[PDB]
Design a protein around this nucleic acid. Sequence first.
DNA 1: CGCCGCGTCAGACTCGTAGGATTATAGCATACGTGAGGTGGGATGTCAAGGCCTTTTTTGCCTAAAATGTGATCTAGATCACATTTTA
Length: 201
Amino acid sequence: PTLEWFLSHCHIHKYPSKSTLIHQGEKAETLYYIVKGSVAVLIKDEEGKEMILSYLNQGDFIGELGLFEEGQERSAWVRAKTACEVAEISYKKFRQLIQVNPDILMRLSAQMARRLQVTSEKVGNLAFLDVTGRIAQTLLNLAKQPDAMTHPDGMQIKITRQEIGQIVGCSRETVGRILKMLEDQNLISAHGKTIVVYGTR
DNA sequence: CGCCGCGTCAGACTCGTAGGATTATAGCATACGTGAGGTGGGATGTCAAGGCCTTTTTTGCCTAAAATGTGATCTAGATCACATTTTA
Ligand SMILES: Nc1ncnc2c1ncn2[C@@H]1O[C@@H]2COP(=O)(O)O[C@H]2[C@H]1O
């Protein structure tokens, strides 16, 4: 199928890595759909410290809060993880798309459900567990991804101490120190950016 | 029977236009009723304060009882210039 009917009518566009997709503060007039690739959600503060909120791969909806409320502003940042490709259409078409067949917003409603529940796990994990707790649990989390690479003893993923520091919200170097604590306890290996995780599977 | 005289009876249809009448007629007195006017007066209608009950607004109050304060003792986060070191 039915998505064929949907993207048969959409306006199609490509864009490179690290381009700014959505600007925090611009008007609510366009929905977007990741056709190919992955993308990352972050936010910004008075200080300018960046805080990665989420990250999503192919098969997800982007630009969903402003669809209903006339003239909302963009409540976060979203920047390209890699060079990736998207289809887009504005809101006046989507009333034609919900009034004719409401299945699209069922799909949106499900992915938005998983979204808000992992946001509940997010705010709880941020709330109560110590630094080791939520860094460990989020490590377990991105071990899940399709982006994660296979390893005969588990998995392996490429990431810097900075960006993981931006999902837990602490300094890159203290993440270095707890990474050393987890190497001392014989649970994770790492060289530079390439971390290798045991315990999976 | 068959005139002749007299009399009776119809004379198309829808619209428009104007305002409109006239003569002369006695006079005064009696006496009675009805119309336009007063007039107190039941009686109705109004407007401002008081006694029955319930509801509402303050307001007692009743005890569970969870909350709001006391402050010295810590803790697990958080930094910054130098020394590399990794990755597209
Ligand atoms: N809690 C969140 N989780 C994931 N993405 C978010 C969140 N908040 C905002 N965004 C993203 O930021 C975008 C800002 O504009 P939209 O609300 O149209 O769509 C939003 C999402 O793509």
